[PDB]
Design a protein around this nucleic acid. Structure first.
Ligand SMILES: [Mg+2]
Ligand SMILES: [Mg+2]
Ligand SMILES: [Mg+2]
Ligand SMILES: [Mg+2]
Ligand SMILES: [Mg+2]
Ligand SMILES: [Mg+2]
Ligand SMILES: [Mg+2]
Ligand SMILES: [Mg+2]
Ligand SMILES: [Mg+2]
Ligand SMILES: [Mg+2]
Ligand SMILES: [Mg+2]
Ligand SMILES: [Mg+2]
Ligand SMILES: [Mg+2]
Ligand SMILES: [Mg+2]
Ligand SMILES: [Mg+2]
Ligand SMILES: [Mg+2]
Ligand SMILES: [Mg+2]
Ligand SMILES: [Mg+2]
Ligand SMILES: [Mg+2]
Ligand SMILES: [Mg+2]
Ligand SMILES: [Mg+2]
Ligand SMILES: [Mg+2]
Ligand SMILES: [Mg+2]
Ligand SMILES: [Mg+2]
Ligand SMILES: [Mg+2]
Ligand SMILES: [Mg+2]
Lengths: 324, 158, 123, 238, 392, 45, 101
RNA sequence: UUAAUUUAUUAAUGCAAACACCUGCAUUAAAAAUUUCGGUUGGGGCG
RNA sequence: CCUCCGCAUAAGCCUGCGUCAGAUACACUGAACUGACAAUUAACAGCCCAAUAUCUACAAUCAACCAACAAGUCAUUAUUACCCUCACUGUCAACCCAACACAGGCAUGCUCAUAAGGAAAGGUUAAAAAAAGUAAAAGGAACUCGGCAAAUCUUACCCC
RNA sequence: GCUACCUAAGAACAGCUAAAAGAGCACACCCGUCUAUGUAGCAAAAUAGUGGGAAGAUUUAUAGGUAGAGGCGACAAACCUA
RNA sequence: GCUAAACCUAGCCCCAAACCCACUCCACCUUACUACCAAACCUUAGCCAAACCAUUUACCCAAAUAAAGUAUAGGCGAUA
């Protein structure tokens, strides 16, 4: 029996809980110009206006019909355009809705009831994620900060069972998966593109009193996804709980509602999440994050209004970085 | 539905026996109703019709215990109502035929109120009476306004 | 094989367990892909008044005197609602029969949002 | 009982239709026919037994091309998919019918008897005397009912006055109007009778349940004894 | 022999009470009560219509009353349409001459070693291996997952040549695009409704491959006809239809010219998968449809010989077998069976790899066949690359 | 080995001995009527 | 409200309003450790999480972010002197997470 | 069952009725139904 | 020291070894006994779908060769209609069917020997008879209805 | 809800030999040849060993059907809640 | 002297008389106790008695009594 951890979660203050489970400290902030703008605007206008649809769309279906193909288009074209600049993107493997699985153990528990009452049992967690887009490479991105990096900010602690934040246990095949099998040469990961589900739209949160939880959703989706992704990568190199990683594992994520974009960088320093391994372990995983900013203010008939360049530049920046 | 002895001797085996009538589909015309009906009849009823001098006479003369047909009773009610109402629907724009028909069967004249209940089952009668006596409850506003008006009129007079 | 126990949503197999409920009123419908649609109007809306400066409190002072118990009747309601108006009309001026609508009577309930019979409102 | 026949389709299609096994039971649920139950699952292919069926807003003789000749689980004979105009249908294939073959369906009775090619369906009046025929109709435009088992052929014995005597495969003569349509030649899957089941398991696959273990005295009765003859029975040898 | 047994059919209504036919009186029914009763008569209820409009409980008007109903029948070719005659039927319907093999120009684009991807064989083998084996957690990925992904990855591999040819930056791939093209053939009204993803779009229209004299030579050619099958076979006969032309995009859309359409036969089951001939027919008709939509947008609703021909390419895939097509529309007057004719260069039954072994084949204790693709040939990918590199 | 004839199933139970099944036939209605007369707490499953 | 007939809704009909709500709520101390934001309630069976959100927002003017409900089975194990099972009532439990921290 | 008593049932036939079906009567078969299997003589066969 | 068991789902059962306080088929003054208190929180699962016509020949087996027979487990389109969202219910246990805390019956996934789960001996003595094993001089069926059992692992027939 | 048979839509079958099969050895699973134990028993039919089958006329879960003048039966007068 | 023994009254029985029952609210024929969608009438047989059994073998029908166990019926038997 393992807890199923959902990157895209309805659970309140899930960022803090995920920080505890993954041993992650969150730090705010990061660690052509005309052709790119044209292409981005083109993709938006194509998915919103230009492309003609036989059946009329609804607001429940708009995320899958409009936003998802937009993100696919953006990723594909921006990989193509920045390929001359970044040779690594040329050799890169691009994945559409490929599963990422991680399974780890973090903490212990004394079974409360039943025939196994009073017996120690490890807490197991499984992340199953379906990122919208994924870029995988044969070489590894360089570390943002050195291993054995010290952060004064401490990892949040929970005073109750994980079950309290709506987390549930189930028993199914344990999977460590990076988006492809181990035989695949593109074992290392570059950038992941996530689209928030329609359930976790901003409008619905505003309709509730979860105005503060907006950014939380984004952060949760980062901490859980990248930790999984990097985790898997680290496990593909033979590193595990007892035999901890020798070099840091880094990855980048772009999380979007379809209008608002948020940017995340993750460094994995520890797979030593078990109690026996965590007994004397100073190292901790790091997540850098940015507040969500709108790519565009609004879309009119055929013209985008209030297009923000800095957001596009930030997408470009993540796509640009290369292995040493 | 009865029993028989096997070879018309009481000493032989007793057996269940059913005697059924012979049935025929025949067409009959009612001049009172000016309609042709296809009905299942026996030879007995055909002979009964012949001796009564027509279907209409047969239906009207014959009481309920002899007819032993729900349809017969409904036909009877139909004809009695036609005769009671002096219904013009029998022969439109032909007064002479209508008058002659009604003159022929003037014997079986009955009040309309009586005619309406002829050949009804108890259940049908219960339903009919319930429908007849069912009215929406009167707003008590109307009752109270009326009684106060009469009271105030009485007060004004004295 | 427990006849006496109350039949509940806990009791049957998977289909059975999903189908039954605890008597909560529906607030929408299901559609393709087992998607649930909440209809806003179907959800009951609590009409909660402003209680600021409300002098009445949960209990009454014991110093308050006892009164004779008289339930409200139709006759009473009519006497101190409609009777003064119609009597005023009769004594001074003219009272028009079949024009009771001016005195607050309605021939039909169909027009109104709140219908007395049958009831179209909650509590 | 709760039995509902699977034969609900009202519109003809060439798509194989899911069919429900009976088990030899009725709507009532009791057995009427023994030795039926639980073979390989089968899908029904609807057969147009009316060979002369002119298309909608069409009349007169029409031609069709054989698309394929195919095994059918539901019958002994092979079936053929045939296309004409914008219509595809399943028919009963003849002994020598191949993909690419062109077959004619006519309602024309010829004064001079037309040459009888194997694939074609003609009225019996058109057909010469002594021609091997199959898929015959008892009544004009009724549909084929009579010679449709594998490797079966009827013989048009004689043609009198608007009437034709045919020999059914059981060597029984039948009177048929000349206007009735039959398909020339022998039905496909000749030497179907020559097949060897080989093991008990094969019949079980075909959906045939084993015969009762009860021993029966005789299929036919014993001859009833007349009044004077009884002394002539039960003679004992000494 | 009528279809549909009596028992399964809707049961006959119960016989009407004799009280109804007797004229004078009115029947006493259980209508007064709000429930059925055996002894009382069965009432006649007037037909009930819901006053308001309920989307969940909507009943459609009959087909006659539909505004778009027409006495004449239109014949729609869509994605699910599967032609009986295959290439034959497509050639007839589109009024086209068939030429075996790719045109020389397209092939020559890859003939040079310069216009090759670095480590071609290795990269293509990796693509096949990723799709067939490495894709998912499952041991053996199904066609529904591997067919789209193989094509996507191959396109991405082609995109890698952007640094050599800057013109490759002037193209996009479009998913969920639908185009409508209507025309007439021998007084038969035909419409192609092309639905599917992987439409490659360019700002620059493709150059015309065939010269004028070749187009003139197509006059001497005659459409080979098939009897007794009608060319309308396996097309949707539709009475309630709209006559409209659609490119699938609003006016002023960048990348408005269709370069290549990629069609995927991704069905898991063989019977659901189109036959290679049928897939070829689908390609011809889709390419024709896209080209005709383009032509009718540019030159209006006039039937005339096109001075500037429209060129659209197609790649039809099974995930293992590829068919390549270049279609040149040179005429929009299709009603007459005689005249100049459109041109189709079709290369068929071109397979990347013979088979793929997901798990190792072991007989006894010794491994016979290793994991990976068997019977791989690169020239098919060269053809794929050739079609991509066209117009660059 | 016997005695384990009862292999419980709520679907089977409700289908065979349920209220609706009882009311389906006149015999079943009389069954309910008998049980009502005896004053049974449990008329059906 | 409970033990009352809810007027049937038709598409484009008026909003359903309750003027005097019949159901009543008791705030209960948790038996197990909960997050600081979480408040436990015992709820009538007929009540929904939507109703509870609206209830708390309306009557008590407390901001509500999330509601989760469960149904607790009361023990029927207990027997009286007549060997007749005594039912402890089934009740509904609601967990409410407060908004604005 | 080749015991006795039946043909209520089914099927067919003939004669009435009715202008092929249904009904009444009779006949023939199948299928059953009800009931019994006295006493002496080792016990069993022939007596 | 054992593990031929375990963990989970399905089905079944329905609070049936959680906390506190009490009296008291081996016993602990403790029990699964009595009373009170507490608890299973949805993402998993259940609970689905506007209408009328219309479409659907080509198995599965790594689906590629090859070979079939018993012939197969999953496809739409055209037109009309359509804009509100995350409700309700299952979630506990040492558990079910066998009158029992019964050497029995009990579907599936994963673990194929365990990371999970358990204890054959209340204490003693070392009688007979009884049961299950282990070893046995010389002989090797002499036993017996019969090589039954055990050991050993075997030929050639006859009848059906 | 056992069982006999059927219907609908499902599931299971390791390893080794085999020109490849209602094939052989052999797990799981199904059955019950022979012996011993047990005989108010663990058990109103079980246990241990030894056995027969174990890709099929196979085994098995779910839902449905056939009802006593009857059903169902690879006839044992078998099974139809000990 | 243990186990025990002892008790009087819940209630019931037969009559008489009199013609009984029937909504707090909500839920309840679908898997009852679940807010909310496209069809009933139809001879009882048999045990039993006849010392077997085969025709037959009392069974309420409009209010006591008496006619009278009479006339009658019936393997003219049992019996009715
Ligand atoms: Mg068959
Ligand atoms: Mg035999
Ligand atoms: Mg029992
Ligand atoms: Mg069972
Ligand atoms: Mg819940
Ligand atoms: Mg307790
Ligand atoms: Mg779900
Ligand atoms: Mg252990
Ligand atoms: Mg012990
Ligand atoms: Mg001892
Ligand atoms: Mg001893
Ligand atoms: Mg020895
Ligand atoms: Mg011897
Ligand atoms: Mg020897
Ligand atoms: Mg001896
Ligand atoms: Mg032995
Ligand atoms: Mg030994
Ligand atoms: Mg079946
Ligand atoms: Mg095997
Ligand atoms: Mg075998
Ligand atoms: Mg074997
Ligand atoms: Mg059997
Ligand atoms: Mg025998
Ligand atoms: Mg015997
Ligand atoms: Mg029994
Ligand atoms: Mg006697």
């Amino acid at each position: 029996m393992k807890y199923m951890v959902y990157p895209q979660t309805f659970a309140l203050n899930a960022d803090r809980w995920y920080q505890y489970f993954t041993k992650t400290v969150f730090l705010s902030g990061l660690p052509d110009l005309a052709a790119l703008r044209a292409v981005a605007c083109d993709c938006l206008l194509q998915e919103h206006f230009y492309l003609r649809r036989r059946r009329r769309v609804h607001r429940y279906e708009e995320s899958e019909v409009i936003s998802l193909p937009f993100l696919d288009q953006l990723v594909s074209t921006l990989v193509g355009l920045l390929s001359p600049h970044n040779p690594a993107l040329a050799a890169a493997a691009l994945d559409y809705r490929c599963p990422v699985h991680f399974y780890w153990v973090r903490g212990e528990e004394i079974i409360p009831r039943g025939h196994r009452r009073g017996r120690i049992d490890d807490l197991r967690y499984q992340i199953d994620d379906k990122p919208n887009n994924q870029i995988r490479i044969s070489k590894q991105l360089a570390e943002f900060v050195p291993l054995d990096y010290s952060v004064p900010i401490e990892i949040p602690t929970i005073k109750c069972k994980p079950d309290k934040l709506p987390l549930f246990k189930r028993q199914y095949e344990n999977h460590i998966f990076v988006g492809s099998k181990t035989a695949d040469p593109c074992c290392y990961g570059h950038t992941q593109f996530h689209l928030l589900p329609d359930k976790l739209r901003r409008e619905r949160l505003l309709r509730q009193n979860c105005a503060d939880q907006i950014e939380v959703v984004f952060r949760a989706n980062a901490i859980a996804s990248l930790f999984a992704w990097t985790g898997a990568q680290a496990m593909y190199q033979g590193f595990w709980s007892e035999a901890d990683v020798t070099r840091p594992f880094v990855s980048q994520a772009v999380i979007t509602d379809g209008k608002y974009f948020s940017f995340f960088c993750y460094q994995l320093n520890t797979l030593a999440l078990t109690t026996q391994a965590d007994q004397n372990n100073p190292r901790k995983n790091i997540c850098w994050g940015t507040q969500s900013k709108p790519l565009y203010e609004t879309i009119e008939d055929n013209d985008v209004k209030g297009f923000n360049d800095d957001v596009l530049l930030q997408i470009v920046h993540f796509l640009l970085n290369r292995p040493k | 539905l009865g029993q028989i002895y096997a070879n018309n001797d009481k000493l032989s085996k007793r057996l269940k026996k059913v005697w059924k009538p012979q049935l025929f589909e025949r067409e009959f015309y009612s001049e009172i109703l000016d309609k042709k009906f296809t009905v299942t009849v026996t030879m007995r009823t055909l002979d009964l019709i012949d001796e009564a001098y027509g279907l209409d006479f047969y239906i009207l003369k014959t009481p309920k215990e002899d007819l032993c047909s729900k349809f017969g009773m409904d036909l009877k009610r139909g004809m009695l109502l036609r005769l009671a109402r002096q219904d013009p629907q029998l022969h439109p724009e032909d007064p002479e035929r209508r008058a002659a028909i009604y003159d022929k069967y003037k014997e079986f004249a009955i009040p309309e109120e009586e005619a309406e209940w002829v050949g009804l089952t108890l259940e049908e009668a219960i339903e009919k009476q319930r429908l007849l006596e069912e009215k929406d409850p009167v707003p008590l506003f109307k009752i109270y306004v009326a009684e106060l008006i009469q009271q105030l009129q009485q007060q004004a007079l004295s | 094989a427990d006849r006496m126990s109350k039949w509940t949503s806990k009791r049957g197999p998977r289909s059975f367990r999903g189908r039954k409920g605890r008597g909560a009123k529906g607030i929408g419908f299901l559609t393709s892909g087992w998607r649930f649609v909440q209809i806003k109007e179907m959800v009951p809306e609590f009409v909660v008044p402003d209680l600021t400066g409300f002098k009445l409190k949960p209990y009454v002072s014991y110093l308050a005197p006892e009164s004779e118990e008289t339930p409200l009747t139709a006759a009473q309601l009519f006497s101190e609602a409609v009777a003064p108006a119609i009597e005023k009309d009769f004594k001074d001026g003219t009272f028009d029969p079949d024009n009771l609508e001016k005195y607050g009577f309605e021939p039909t309930q169909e027009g109104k949002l709140f219908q007395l019979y049958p009831r179209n409102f909650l509590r | 009982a709760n039995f509902v026949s699977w034969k609900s389709r009202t519109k003809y299609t060439i798509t194989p239709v899911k069919m429900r096994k009976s088990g030899g039971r009725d709507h009532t649920g009791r057995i009427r026919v023994h030795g039926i139950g639980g073979g390989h699952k089968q899908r029904y292919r609807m057969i147009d037994f009316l060979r002369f069926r002119p298309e909608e807003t069409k009349s007169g003789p029409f031609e069709e091309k054989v698309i394929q000749v195919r095994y059918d689980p539901c019958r002994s004979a092979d079936i053929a998919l045939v296309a004409g105009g914008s219509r595809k249908r399943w028919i009963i294939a003849t002994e020598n019918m191949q993909a690419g073959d062109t077959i004619l369906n006519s309602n024309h009775i010829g004064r001079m008897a037309v040459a009888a090619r194997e694939g074609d369906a003609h009225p019996l009046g058109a057909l010469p005397v002594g021609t091997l025929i199959n898929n015959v109709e008892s009544e004009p435009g009724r549909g084929a009912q009579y010679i449709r088992a594998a490797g079966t052929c009827g013989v048009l014995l004689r043609k009198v006055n608007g009437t034709a005597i045919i020999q059914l495969p059981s060597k029984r003569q039948m009177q048929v109007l000349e206007t009735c349509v039959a398909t020339v030649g022998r039905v496909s899957n000749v030497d179907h009778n020559k097949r060897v089941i080989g093991k008990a398991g094969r019949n079980r696959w075909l959906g045939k349940r084993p015969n009762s273990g009860r021993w029966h005295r005789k299929g036919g009765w014993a001859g009833r004894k007349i009044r004077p003859l009884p002394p002539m029975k039960s003679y004992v040898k000494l | 022999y009528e279809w549909g047994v009596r028992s399964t059919r809707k049961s006959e209504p119960p016989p009407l009470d004799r009280v109804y036919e007797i004229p004078g009186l009115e029947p006493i029914t259980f209508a007064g009560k709000m429930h059925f009763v055996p002894w009382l008569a069965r009432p006649i209820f007037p037909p009930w219509d819901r006053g308001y409009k309920d989307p969940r409980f909507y009943r459609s008007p009959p087909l006659h009353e539909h505004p778009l109903y027409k006495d004449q029948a239109c014949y729609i070719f869509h994605h699910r349409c599967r032609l009986l005659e295959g290439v034959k039927q497509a050639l007839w319907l589109t009024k086209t001459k068939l030429i075996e093999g790719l045109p020389e120009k397209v092939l020559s684009l890859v003939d040079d070693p310069r216009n090759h991807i670095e480590n071609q064989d290795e990269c293509v083998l990796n693509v096949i291996s990723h799709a067939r084996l490495w894709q998912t957690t499952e041991e053996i990925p199904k066609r529904e997952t591997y067919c789209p992904v193989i094509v996507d990855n191959l396109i991405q591999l082609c995109k890698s040549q952007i640094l050599k040819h800057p013109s490759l930056a002037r193209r996009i791939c479009v998913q969920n695009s639908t185009f409508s093209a209507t025309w007439n053939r021998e007084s038969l009204l035909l419409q192609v409704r092309g639905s599917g993803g992987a439409r490659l779009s360019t700002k620059d229209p493709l150059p015309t491959i065939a010269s004028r004299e070749e187009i003139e030579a197509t006059k001497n050619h005659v459409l080979e006809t098939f009897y007794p099958i009608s060319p309308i076979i396996d097309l949707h006969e539709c009475n309630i239809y709209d006559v409209k032309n659609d490119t699938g995009f609003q006016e002023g859309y960048p990348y408005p010219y269709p370069h290549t359409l990629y069609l995927l036969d991704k069905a898991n089951l063989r019977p659901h998968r189109l036959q290679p001939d049928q897939l070829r027919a689908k390609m011809i008709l889709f390419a024709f449809g896209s080209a005709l939509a383009q032509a009718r947008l540019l030159y209006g609703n006039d039937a005339k010989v096109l001075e500037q021909p429209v060129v659209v390419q197609s790649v039809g895939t099974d995930g293992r077998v590829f068919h390549f097509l270049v279609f040149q529309l040179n005429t929009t007057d299709l009603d007459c069976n005689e005249g100049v004719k459109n041109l189709a260069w079709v290369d068929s039954d071109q397979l990347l790899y013979q088979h793929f072994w997901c798990l190792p084949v072991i007989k006894k204790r010794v491994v016979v066949e290793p994991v990976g693709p068997v019977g791989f040939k690169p020239e098919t990918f060269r053809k794929f690359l050739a079609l991509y590199l066209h117009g660059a | 080995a016997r005695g384990n004839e009862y292999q419980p199933s709520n679907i089977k139970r409700k289908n065979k001995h349920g209220w609706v099944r009882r009311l389906s036939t006149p015999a079943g209605v009389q069954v309910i009527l008998r049980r009502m007369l005896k004053g049974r707490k449990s008329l059906s499953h | 409200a409970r033990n009352v007939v809810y007027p049937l809704y038709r598409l484009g009909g008026p909003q359903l309003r309750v003027f005097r709500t019949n159901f009543f709520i008791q705030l209960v101390r948790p038996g197990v450790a909960q997050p600081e934001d979480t408040v436990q309630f015992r709820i009538p069976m007929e009540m929904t999480r939507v109703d509870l959100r609206n209830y708390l927002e309306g009557i008590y003017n407390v901001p509500v972010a999330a509601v989760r409900t469960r149904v607790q089975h009361g023990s029927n194990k207990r027997r009286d002197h007549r060997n007749v099972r005594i039912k402890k009532p089934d009740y509904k439990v609601a967990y409410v997470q407060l908004a604005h921290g």
